Amino acid sequence: SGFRKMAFPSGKVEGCMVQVTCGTTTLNGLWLDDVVYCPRHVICTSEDMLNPNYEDLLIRKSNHNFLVQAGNVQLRVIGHSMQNCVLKLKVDTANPKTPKYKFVRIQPGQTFSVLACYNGSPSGVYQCAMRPNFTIKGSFLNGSCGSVGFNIDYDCVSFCYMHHMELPTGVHAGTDLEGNFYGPFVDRQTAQAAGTDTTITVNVLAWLYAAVINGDRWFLNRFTTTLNDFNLVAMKYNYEPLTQDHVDILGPLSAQTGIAVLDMCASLKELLQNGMNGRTILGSALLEDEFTPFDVVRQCSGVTF
Amino acid sequence: SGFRKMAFPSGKVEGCMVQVTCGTTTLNGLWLDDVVYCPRHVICTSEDMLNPNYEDLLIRKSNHNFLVQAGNVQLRVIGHSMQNCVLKLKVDTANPKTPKYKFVRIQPGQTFSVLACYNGSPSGVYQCAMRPNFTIKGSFLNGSCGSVGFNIDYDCVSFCYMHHMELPTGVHAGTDLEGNFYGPFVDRQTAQAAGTDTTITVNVLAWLYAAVINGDRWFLNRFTTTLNDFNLVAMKYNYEPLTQDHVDILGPLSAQTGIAVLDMCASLKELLQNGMNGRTILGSALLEDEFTPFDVVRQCSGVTFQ
Numbered sequence A: 001s002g003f004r005k006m007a008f009p010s011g012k013v014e015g016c017m018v019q020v021t022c023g024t025t026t027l028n029g030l031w032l033d034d035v036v037y038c039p040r041h042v043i044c045t046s047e048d049m050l051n052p053n054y055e056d057l058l059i060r061k062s063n064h065n066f067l068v069q070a071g072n073v074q075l076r077v078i079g080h081s082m083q084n085c086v087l088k089l090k091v092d093t094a095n096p097k098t099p100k101y102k103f104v105r106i107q108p109g110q111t112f113s114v115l116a117c118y119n120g121s122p123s124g125v126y127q128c129a130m131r132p133n134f135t136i137k138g139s140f141l142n143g144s145c146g147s148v149g150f151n152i153d154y155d156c157v158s159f160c161y162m163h164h165m166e167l168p169t170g171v172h173a174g175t176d177l178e179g180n181f182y183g184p185f186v187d188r189q190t191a192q193a194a195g196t197d198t199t200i201t202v203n204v205l206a207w208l209y210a211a212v213i214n215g216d217r218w219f220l221n222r223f224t225t226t227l228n229d230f231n232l233v234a235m236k237y238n239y240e241p242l243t244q245d246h247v248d249i250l251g252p253l254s255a256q257t258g259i260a261v262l263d264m265c266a267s268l269k270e271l272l273q274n275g276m277n278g279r280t281i282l283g284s285a286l287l288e289d290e291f292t293p294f295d296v297v298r299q300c301s302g303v304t305f
Numbered sequence B: 001s002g003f004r005k006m007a008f009p010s011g012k013v014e015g016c017m018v019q020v021t022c023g024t025t026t027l028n029g030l031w032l033d034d035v036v037y038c039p040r041h042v043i044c045t046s047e048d049m050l051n052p053n054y055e056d057l058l059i060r061k062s063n064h065n066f067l068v069q070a071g072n073v074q075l076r077v078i079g080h081s082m083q084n085c086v087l088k089l090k091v092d093t094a095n096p097k098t099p100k101y102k103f104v105r106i107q108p109g110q111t112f113s114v115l116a117c118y119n120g121s122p123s124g125v126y127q128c129a130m131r132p133n134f135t136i137k138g139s140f141l142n143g144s145c146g147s148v149g150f151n152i153d154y155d156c157v158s159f160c161y162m163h164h165m166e167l168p169t170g171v172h173a174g175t176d177l178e179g180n181f182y183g184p185f186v187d188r189q190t191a192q193a194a195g196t197d198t199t200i201t202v203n204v205l206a207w208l209y210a211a212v213i214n215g216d217r218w219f220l221n222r223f224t225t226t227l228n229d230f231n232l233v234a235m236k237y238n239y240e241p242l243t244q245d246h247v248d249i250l251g252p253l254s255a256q257t258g259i260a261v262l263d264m265c266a267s268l269k270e271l272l273q274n275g276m277n278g279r280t281i282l283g284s285a286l287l288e289d290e291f292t293p294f295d296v297v298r299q300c301s302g303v304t305f306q
């Protein structure tokens, strides 16, 4: 029993974290095979960050201008290239701790583990959702840049996120490992704001299924609804529309608990309209939307990699 | 710049997790140097559940009755002893992945990371607190016994918890790594129940300090309180008594925010009276009690968002 916000075990990713320094800028890199991945803005000063020409700044740099440190070991850089907003530094040594991995781009509403790092040293691990507005509600300080996000599937690490910046509202923005931003952000010192966010409906429903599996049942009711009726309520409450694909994904939890997705939507309708009437669900007084259906099945059945 | 339940990186503990089998019972063990630590109840059978005599069950085992598997490698058991409720199996190989480590017994209110494991394989990592009633609110299914709790301050792993059992309310009980239970619990299937739990007052205050560091002041007030008047109010909401030790421990957070500890106490008194009026603090609509003053200083900025 019990339901907790749970990260993937971080050991496979800890063995890949290095320190990258260019001039006075130090941040984290990801050392896989013979390449170190890091944000391209490592080559910038503060002056540069106002209106940077990355092409221009990089051609003026050579391999020896990148200091890469793996624990107390200096790696020899033998090449440097840019892919979108990520810098790739070829080193003369393959990382002997490289796990089986691939690069994946996640969808809004999907979850991942962040390994928060400073100076190439892992500091903490926590679970995040890619928000509908493509930010993450992370916990990051100066030096966290190049910290990475990932999932594990069997023995394969799927890298999905590299940390680039904090927004004025205290939320965070970054790229996939191919250097493509999540959301309408750029790597420059300029005016940028998180768009108005929305609640991830399919995840709230998953979390209500988690609650029922853990004996929290007060919110259940005799009623059912339709996708169209529910989606009018969703729109009003700044909830994402529920699709047939989402209903299908919750199929397992519907079956296991005997509450149909639209049976649970009728619960969620009542909660949005009426509140929790002083009650809690799984120790929260808010409707939690950072657990996916997979997260709930996974945690409630003890999958292990 | 954000505030999250953050666990320690789990890699140094992952490299220590093994499977222990005795009879038909398999759970997790912790392989440090040439010793594997696991719950002694691995030697129990379907009848020896209510009133097991561990000394009598153990003297009937040879080293070769314990199957210890580190991934695909079988370890050879060359010695066994019991210390309180923990079994120690001496093995003929020291774990090459043993980190710098120590064993520490924690007090209620302290936090730690749990590496939930099944069949000696890690499933996930999350943060817990030792509750005032000596339980933890974990996420544990059948086969998770031998899963451990730890902190990592400065490359040294401090092991503080080993998971033994789930109580009827769905909360979790276990031991330190010397095998002494936290709380009045025993490794027997006799009827056991957690005491009435209380809120960890010092941690709620630390978290309110966290909220101020991250730029939120809406819940503050112009009032102060005596420590005694605070405790008379707080206990009416099932809050732990705040001691002068707890006041002292909050001094650095008080200094960083310029909010006196007893002024923050007056803010907490008012929040208990009013609730949050549909507002949130650090993403919660409840008062969070599983962040310590040390956790807030580790995670939060040295500079306050004024």
Ligand SMILES: O=C(O)CCc1nccs1
Pocket (backbone or CB within 6 Å): A027, A140, A141, A142, A143, A144, A145, A146, A163, A164, A165, A166, A172, B001
């Ligand atoms: O500057 C960095 O290291 C990354 C962006 C930030 N994230 C949080 C605070 S500053």
Ligand SMILES: O=C(O)CCc1nccs1
Pocket (backbone or CB within 6 Å): B046, B047, B048, B049, B050, B051
């Ligand atoms: O746990 C015990 O000591 C007895 C349990 C039993 N099982 C069958 C008969 S009596």
Ligand SMILES: O=C(O)CCc1nccs1
Pocket (backbone or CB within 6 Å): A001, B027, B140, B141, B142, B143, B144, B145, B163, B164, B165, B166
């Ligand atoms: O610990 C075990 O492996 C059996 C009893 C349980 N402990 C936690 C959930 S069920």
Ligand SMILES: [Cl-]
Pocket (backbone or CB within 6 Å): B105, B106, B107, B110
């Ligand atoms: Cl302690």
Ligand code: NA
Pocket (backbone or CB within 6 Å): A220, A221, A222, A223, A224, A262, A263, A264, A266, A267
């Ligand atoms: Na219903």
